[PDB]
């Protein structure tokens, strides 16, 4: 059936939308070519609708049904708890969209009476109404990018805050624990950057002759079928669950997950959804499950030998035993025909890679460097264009999320993150004495509140001390970076070294947590380097739950 159906109404905005990068002295010292930095807006929604709207072809087979059974079997071992209103409430981001029922994120997190009552009723309705479609709002997402030699806005779809709290109560535990129990080590979200790189390298090294490939599904969310969603439910149904939870999962599937009406910000009726809603709690879990299912079965159909998979929602990367240049190519193609039939056509044509550094999964690739001792250290990196573009934007305008704080944390080892992202922001945070002001960044969909002063501890725990001494980066990685800088109009690395020297001096001058930031984050700025030793207060930090599960668009906030 058609992924979407439109009445004719338009996807509208609430407030005005800034699409151009301001001429700010602060952002300008970071990125000069401001005209190459844009933000998507509702004005392009139309194009995106034109791409995500199509008819889904899907033919199942024995391979598919066999992989399904296996997944169910593991599902059975899971026992999911029903969250309390209080618990689900504490999970709501402070700035989550308010309900159209006289209360907002702040009220929910505060267990206010009105909010709680409506939740109670929204919940009681999920237990009694097992059919009526549930209303969802559709909006144009606002994301920053760099022009190319422009992308249309992606469309977000979500139900009312009341429903979201109920989803958490009935499924937060399921989506936090089931992907793992089912996919085992193939479930990507359990790994921290360091751990993901560990898994990729060991896997590659364990193949007699490794062949790997990433697979890009053309608009995954619109490729997901009601059948996919119901199969996704049958898995959830294998868990031991409390009665009301079992009903909630059932009613949510029929009234929300499989599809439903779409309403713009003005209250008009835009159309109807019959595929994955990007903004629900089960979006990450379902996509990871669905994508894993289809890929596993496709892998068999294609006859790839000794496959090892890594799935992150819709992102997929496979590494296997190569047969031969030709065999591999013919097999990949067979794999794509499998996926196509399971309703997961390719966006970009899947190319078989024979060098781990060439494969790009989750927008990252492997690269090598050396620590103080010259020992080789594999780390995760990527083209820094978007990250830089967003730092600039986030510098000129106060945004809800700081993609830059997240990128530093996720790319603390990379060249650009240390030399630019760190230098630039600590520079500005000093000038505004906000080194202690907590900012909301985001990791795997989940929204975290973090104090810049903690970064050192965080980085040491998620990466290891080598993240402060990495050096001697590969030429390929250096060139991509320098190239990128010239393109955007960002000062050359030598300027950042100079700048980092200054910012460091100041940091140390302040003593305390800051003096540390300068010692560890910027030890690369000096030549008479300090011997960096484990940081005490780090291991005392609670980082449990940080790399356990993805929650893209899940409205999750545990900080």
From Swiss-Prot:
Residues 210-328 form the RdRp catalytic domain. The N-terminus is phosphorylated by host PRK2/PKN2. Its cofactor is Mg(2+). It is a single-pass type IV membrane protein. The modification Phosphoserine is found at residues 29, 42. Activity is up-regulated by PRK2/PKN2-mediated phosphorylation. This is RNA-directed RNA polymerase. It comes from Hepatitis C virus genotype 1b (strain HC-J4).
